[PDB]
Amino acid sequence: NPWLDLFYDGEDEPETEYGSMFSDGKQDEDPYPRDNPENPYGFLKFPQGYAVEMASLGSKVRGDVRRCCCVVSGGVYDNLLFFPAIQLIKDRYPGVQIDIITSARGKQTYEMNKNVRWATVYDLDDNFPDPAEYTDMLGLLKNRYYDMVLSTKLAGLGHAAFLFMTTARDRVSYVYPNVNAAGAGLLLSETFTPDSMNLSEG
Amino acid sequence: MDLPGPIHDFLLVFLGSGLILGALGVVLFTNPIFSAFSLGLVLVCISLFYILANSHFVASAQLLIYVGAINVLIIFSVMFMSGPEYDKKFQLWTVGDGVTSLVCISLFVSLISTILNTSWYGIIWTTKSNQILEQDLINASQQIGIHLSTDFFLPFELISIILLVSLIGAIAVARQ
Amino acid sequence: KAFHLLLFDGSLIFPECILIFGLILLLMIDSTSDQKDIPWLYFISSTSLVMSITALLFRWREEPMISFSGNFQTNNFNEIFQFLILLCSTLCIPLSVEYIECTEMALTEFLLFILTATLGGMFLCGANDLITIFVAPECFSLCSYLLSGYTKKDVRSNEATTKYLLMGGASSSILVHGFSWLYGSSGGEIELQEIVNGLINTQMYNSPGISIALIFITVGIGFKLSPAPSHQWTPDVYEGSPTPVVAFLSVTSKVAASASATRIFDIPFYFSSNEWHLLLEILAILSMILGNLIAITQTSMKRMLAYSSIGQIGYVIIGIIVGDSNDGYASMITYMLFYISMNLGTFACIVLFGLRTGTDNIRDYAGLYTKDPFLALSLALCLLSLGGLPPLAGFFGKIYLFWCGWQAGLYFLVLIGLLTSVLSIYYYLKIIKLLMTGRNQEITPHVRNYRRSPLRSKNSIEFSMIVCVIASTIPGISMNPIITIAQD
Amino acid sequence: EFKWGTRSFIWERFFEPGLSPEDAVSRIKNTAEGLHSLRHMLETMSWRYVIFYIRLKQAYLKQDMKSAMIMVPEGRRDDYSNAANELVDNMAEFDYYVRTPKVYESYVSYEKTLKSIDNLLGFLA
Amino acid sequence: MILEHVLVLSAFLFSIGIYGLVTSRNLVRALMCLELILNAVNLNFVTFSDFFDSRQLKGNIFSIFVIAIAAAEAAIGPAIVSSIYRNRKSIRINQSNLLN
Amino acid sequence: LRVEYYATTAEPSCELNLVRSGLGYCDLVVGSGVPAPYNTLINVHYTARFSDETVFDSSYKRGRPLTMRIGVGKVIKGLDQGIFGGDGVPPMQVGGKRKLRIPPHLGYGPEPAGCFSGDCNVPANATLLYDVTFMGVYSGNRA
Amino acid sequence: IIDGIPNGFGVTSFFVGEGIKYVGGGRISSYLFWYLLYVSIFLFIFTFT
Amino acid sequence: YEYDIFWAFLIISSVIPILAFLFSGILAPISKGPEKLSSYESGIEPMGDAWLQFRIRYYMFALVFVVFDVETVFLYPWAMSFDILGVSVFIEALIFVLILIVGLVYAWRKGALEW
Ligand SMILES: CCC[C@H]1CC[C@H]([C@H]2CC[C@@H](O[C@@H]3O[C@H](CO)[C@@H](O[C@H]4O[C@H](CO)[C@@H](O)[C@H](O)[C@H]4O)[C@H](O)[C@H]3O)CC2)CC1
């Protein structure tokens, strides 16, 4: 583990401030950049000193997410039980857009959900997918530019790589409790080990 | 125009040992104040080396400018750091330092296998005509003044522009 | 005395003396008068950067000469590069005056730093000595450290300045160590066309200490050009610096470093061509491979343009590698001239989009065609020219670069260049794919509240002098080379 | 081969076994030739080049004269030694007149050193 | 004489400075190690001017210019350090990895 | 000793006009151009051989003529006297081809040159032979 | 099988690009160490061997 | 020689404090105690160990001093060669002094030299 992150230098000092703007609060509280109707060229109103491009600062400093991808495995029951997690994402991150990847049966569950933007059908149970369909889904996920991706499917090396190629800042997944999930946590920002080989047993 | 031979070699060895001690103090001290004070020893030893070779003006310029630099460095290290922290005292060792120690040892070995294999005295006897000084220029600082004023005119004004712009940028960036 | 010998030699650097006079006049007026006016600063920066070209074009037909006692060489090769530096500064001043004014910061200091970096870039183009091959890029690198952290308040700019200062102190000291090794094992010679003779005079042209100097010089120069693993300074600095300064450092730094690399690998290092040829081949192959592969996995526009720049530099390196025989240096220019317009247009569109929008993420570029079709069209044209798409400048520039490579027998380099150019379409097409999304649900609120406003603005003129160039130079690629094969 | 002077001086000083007498006599001859060639640099008042040459040739001679005693027959080995000592003394004087430079005294010591080394070659044969 | 030993020391300094440039957890210390590297380069230049350039003194002039450049860097930072400490109240450079 | 093997055909022979300094020279081709100017950079082509006619250096090996500042002692004394002239030697003109016999005292002297890694490029007390060819005065632009 | 070759090319390109992007770290000390390791490698290649 | 006296004088000047320290060590008694070794704080017990952390605007003259030291170092060789050469070096160093004056004016007007 030292050999992975060389020059670690511990964690951040308690007195670090991370600047002034885009430092505290939530996503809906940011006062800058604001509209400048008096500008003849349509340029916004920016704070003194700060660079013009400020929307990228919240992701680095405050860890804001605007588009989230929840790849929920299972049918109607699991996708229904994932509703409090979706509401939690909406409450914690105001203004976020949540997209769901699930099976054909689980996609119909999100008809009665007020928080999901897109619900997409993808055969997650197939361990050997069609190369064209797999590539199309991966490119779609790459082109949505998800800030964070969560996976309730038990992720091996292949699912970890699929989440890795999503270009998401946070890659969070459930992993296999057995030895076959070795190296999956290297490609994921956060890993969860359930108490059994079946997550729906809970 | 030199010291006696054994005295010259003993001074070389002694100042080299002092320089090694100062550099090791620089790269092994947690406190920027302590490592800055070791840097001052390095500066003094290097100025003495310049005096040893033939450079009586470059040594004085090194002393003046680099002493100003280390004084400013100590001031800004006092001002931009936490408490005095005498307890820090030789920061800890990590793997990330151990790999770079090997890399730097390899680099130093590569340099010293060339220095120890090249006959530097052979080059001196080939550049005979480059060592025939003008008899009128007795003062070495006079030669350095003439060759700074005439041979290098464009860098002499470029460094003035560089210093002015560096002063302006230092004032503008560091202002509250 | 006479003050004449320097007076006649001082007229040779008159285009740089104009820049120095404009710099001093701007500084004196800033100090003297309390009030600040944007139009006067615009006027002084422009008239400093359009009188240097006026004087330089008047000096084009003059005889080549080495002035200031083996310190400044004026010939056909360096004049083109000095003109390129002046063109970059002229097309980057409108990019800077609006951007720094909208950040509510002092702008005379920014113009001073840009003018000094231009002055230190023009001197690097012809720098026929070893001291001024060190002092002049320190007139550029120090200003680049003062820039890219001029924001002074964003937490990104401080880290970018830290990385730039530390990595460029790591370089430009390895470079001077190589200069010391080259100066020592030569007989105390520092003029460019006088140390190969000095090497033979001391018979150290096959010494092991010459290989150290070549490697150190190549490393210190490949830091500034940023090919191959000397590239890591580029993206972070490109991601955490204001857009006009990073555009300047994208176009001005590569021109000066390319000129220095051409004048330091051909004039004083022609006897050991078989070594720096291999070094540059590795430096170019790694650059294209690892600058086009990482750019397709980028979520930020400035960082993607950084990987783009470190990919396109490898195409230009082929011009040094082939040599002056099979064109070569005539293919460095006529592509760097292209590259300047390509990058300055694709950065002007980014400048306007960020100023009117307030973002840098690529995902917020969706639906710009519906809001501003002109800006989307211009950015798409710049990016397609960047990808070497047929009717735009990059395609003819790349086939010119590859014709000389094939003519010199470098099949591997041309094949890697073509494969990386194929890889270099997916990006420069991803942004357009975003730009043509009519889905209102995928459109970010950043561009939903977008006001184009009924005024022209300066950057529009500056990139209308550019977008019409990257498309309409495609017939005029016979006028340019006859000015670039004329140099030798 | 060249047998000496082909690497850095400190490496040949400290990390080399040394020279056989048959190479030491050749180094004596080369030192004498270099001393003969040093006259032009002495006349141009280039004291740094001369002092470097004198120190290097001294460092060569302290080994070579000691290790070339074998080639001298027993009937002359004392007298040769005397000549060797004389040469050292002369070079010392030359040293003393290049550092703290003088023109007349350095020239006098230069001629004395040339005569002493010619006597040393006459003894070595 | 053993003048070449100076070269050895210069090389050592360079490597040591290079080492101190990498393991630096304080950017003031990184600036000091930059001064160390430039000092090693200057030692090489001065001893080479002593060796081969007793008349023109090009190495001494280059050493003066390198000292000037080093002082210009030492003026530009710690002003950059001043901006960083005013904005973040921390100096440790390895802890700032936002741009990655 | 450390001679790099370069295969080159020989030049026409001469009778050597020995001078007071010990240099020998002949005018194979008398140049019609400007004579070698003092304190100026000039490009010449040369083929430096040792005694016993073994070539150790050549500007044709590197592919371009060598540029040196002539007349101010930036080469060996024999080459300067052969090219720039003086002491009974007329200066060479542009396009002129001249043979040169540099004695050891006009060359590297009794000290070997280019010594590193167990060998030296030029031995001690070696007479050198140079087939120099004044290509021209240095100019920034080639045709 | 046949269609797996181009899609496999794209997937491997994506994976290698992501791996090279993520393997560094983004810290300045890592930048300097990687910048200096290849200098050491070049020096060992072109001088020692 | 004019510089062996310099080395001998430097050695003697460095030796003198060593002699003073040795003489004090062999002459003066030692009577150390825990109250004696405490840091002096005008009678009262010192609080936290020293440390002041000045403001930046106070210590911004040092960045001017770094540049001005280099400028005054560069001015010396010109003055040494002012008589051998003529008005050429006068014109050369006039720009140096003018740039120095302009930088001083900038530092004065921007408030860098204000306390
Ligand atoms: C076969 C394909 C090529 C290659 C295989 C191996 C692949 C990498 C993937 C991941 C990388 O990760 C390493 O682990 C570290 C965690 O500590 C990272 O450090 C982070 O630390 C923070 C989170 O802990 C983040 O904020 C930082 O951005 C990041 O530095 C470190 O980057 C990296 O060393 C190891 C193997 C790549 C594809």
JSON list of C-alpha atoms and ligand atoms in Angstrom, two decimals, chain A residues 4-5 164 186, chain E residues 97 100, chain G residues 15 19-20 22-25 27, ligand 1:
[
{"chain": "A", "resi": 4, "resn": "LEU", "atom": "CA", "xyz": [0.91, 2.44, -4.63]},
{"chain": "A", "resi": 5, "resn": "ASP", "atom": "CA", "xyz": [0.67, 6.04, -3.38]},
{"chain": "A", "resi": 164, "resn": "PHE", "atom": "CA", "xyz": [-13.20, 2.53, -14.19]},
{"chain": "A", "resi": 186, "resn": "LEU", "atom": "CA", "xyz": [-7.69, -0.70, -6.89]},
{"chain": "E", "resi": 97, "resn": "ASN", "atom": "CA", "xyz": [-3.27, 17.21, -5.40]},
{"chain": "E", "resi": 100, "resn": "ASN", "atom": "CA", "xyz": [-4.79, 15.36, -11.17]},
{"chain": "G", "resi": 15, "resn": "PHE", "atom": "CA", "xyz": [-8.60, 1.03, -20.40]},
{"chain": "G", "resi": 19, "resn": "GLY", "atom": "CA", "xyz": [-4.72, 3.40, -16.39]},
{"chain": "G", "resi": 20, "resn": "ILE", "atom": "CA", "xyz": [-1.99, 5.77, -17.54]},
{"chain": "G", "resi": 22, "resn": "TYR", "atom": "CA", "xyz": [-4.68, 7.21, -12.91]},
{"chain": "G", "resi": 23, "resn": "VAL", "atom": "CA", "xyz": [-1.27, 5.61, -12.29]},
{"chain": "G", "resi": 24, "resn": "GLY", "atom": "CA", "xyz": [0.67, 8.83, -11.59]},
{"chain": "G", "resi": 25, "resn": "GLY", "atom": "CA", "xyz": [-0.96, 10.51, -8.61]},
{"chain": "G", "resi": 27, "resn": "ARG", "atom": "CA", "xyz": [1.59, 15.13, -6.63]},
{"chain": "I", "resi": 1, "resn": "LIG", "atom": "C1", "xyz": [-3.69, -2.71, -17.05]},
{"chain": "I", "resi": 1, "resn": "LIG", "atom": "C2", "xyz": [-4.19, -1.28, -17.27]},
{"chain": "I", "resi": 1, "resn": "LIG", "atom": "C3", "xyz": [-3.16, -0.23, -16.90]},
{"chain": "I", "resi": 1, "resn": "LIG", "atom": "C4", "xyz": [-3.19, 0.20, -15.43]},
{"chain": "I", "resi": 1, "resn": "LIG", "atom": "C5", "xyz": [-3.40, -0.87, -14.41]},
{"chain": "I", "resi": 1, "resn": "LIG", "atom": "C6", "xyz": [-3.28, -0.32, -13.02]},
{"chain": "I", "resi": 1, "resn": "LIG", "atom": "C7", "xyz": [-4.10, 0.92, -12.70]},
{"chain": "I", "resi": 1, "resn": "LIG", "atom": "C8", "xyz": [-3.91, 1.72, -11.43]},
{"chain": "I", "resi": 1, "resn": "LIG", "atom": "C9", "xyz": [-5.29, 2.07, -10.98]},
{"chain": "I", "resi": 1, "resn": "LIG", "atom": "C10", "xyz": [-5.34, 2.89, -9.72]},
{"chain": "I", "resi": 1, "resn": "LIG", "atom": "C11", "xyz": [-4.00, 3.29, -9.16]},
{"chain": "I", "resi": 1, "resn": "LIG", "atom": "O1", "xyz": [-4.27, 3.86, -7.91]},
{"chain": "I", "resi": 1, "resn": "LIG", "atom": "C12", "xyz": [-3.18, 4.18, -7.09]},
{"chain": "I", "resi": 1, "resn": "LIG", "atom": "O2", "xyz": [-3.73, 4.22, -5.81]},
{"chain": "I", "resi": 1, "resn": "LIG", "atom": "C13", "xyz": [-3.83, 5.39, -5.09]},
{"chain": "I", "resi": 1, "resn": "LIG", "atom": "C14", "xyz": [-4.98, 5.24, -4.06]},
{"chain": "I", "resi": 1, "resn": "LIG", "atom": "O3", "xyz": [-4.53, 5.84, -2.88]},
{"chain": "I", "resi": 1, "resn": "LIG", "atom": "C15", "xyz": [-4.06, 6.61, -5.95]},
{"chain": "I", "resi": 1, "resn": "LIG", "atom": "O4", "xyz": [-4.08, 7.72, -5.13]},
{"chain": "I", "resi": 1, "resn": "LIG", "atom": "C16", "xyz": [-5.24, 8.45, -5.18]},
{"chain": "I", "resi": 1, "resn": "LIG", "atom": "O5", "xyz": [-5.34, 8.89, -3.88]},
{"chain": "I", "resi": 1, "resn": "LIG", "atom": "C17", "xyz": [-6.48, 9.58, -3.59]},
{"chain": "I", "resi": 1, "resn": "LIG", "atom": "C18", "xyz": [-7.56, 8.60, -3.10]},
{"chain": "I", "resi": 1, "resn": "LIG", "atom": "O6", "xyz": [-6.91, 7.77, -2.17]},
{"chain": "I", "resi": 1, "resn": "LIG", "atom": "C19", "xyz": [-6.98, 10.42, -4.77]},
{"chain": "I", "resi": 1, "resn": "LIG", "atom": "O7", "xyz": [-7.51, 11.62, -4.28]},
{"chain": "I", "resi": 1, "resn": "LIG", "atom": "C20", "xyz": [-5.81, 10.86, -5.67]},
{"chain": "I", "resi": 1, "resn": "LIG", "atom": "O8", "xyz": [-6.30, 11.43, -6.85]},
{"chain": "I", "resi": 1, "resn": "LIG", "atom": "C21", "xyz": [-5.00, 9.63, -6.13]},
{"chain": "I", "resi": 1, "resn": "LIG", "atom": "O9", "xyz": [-3.66, 9.94, -6.05]},
{"chain": "I", "resi": 1, "resn": "LIG", "atom": "C22", "xyz": [-2.85, 6.78, -6.87]},
{"chain": "I", "resi": 1, "resn": "LIG", "atom": "O10", "xyz": [-3.26, 7.63, -7.89]},
{"chain": "I", "resi": 1, "resn": "LIG", "atom": "C23", "xyz": [-2.42, 5.48, -7.57]},
{"chain": "I", "resi": 1, "resn": "LIG", "atom": "O11", "xyz": [-1.08, 5.30, -7.24]},
{"chain": "I", "resi": 1, "resn": "LIG", "atom": "C24", "xyz": [-3.09, 2.08, -9.10]},
{"chain": "I", "resi": 1, "resn": "LIG", "atom": "C25", "xyz": [-3.17, 1.12, -10.27]},
{"chain": "I", "resi": 1, "resn": "LIG", "atom": "C26", "xyz": [-4.01, 1.91, -13.86]},
{"chain": "I", "resi": 1, "resn": "LIG", "atom": "C27", "xyz": [-4.24, 1.24, -15.19]}
]
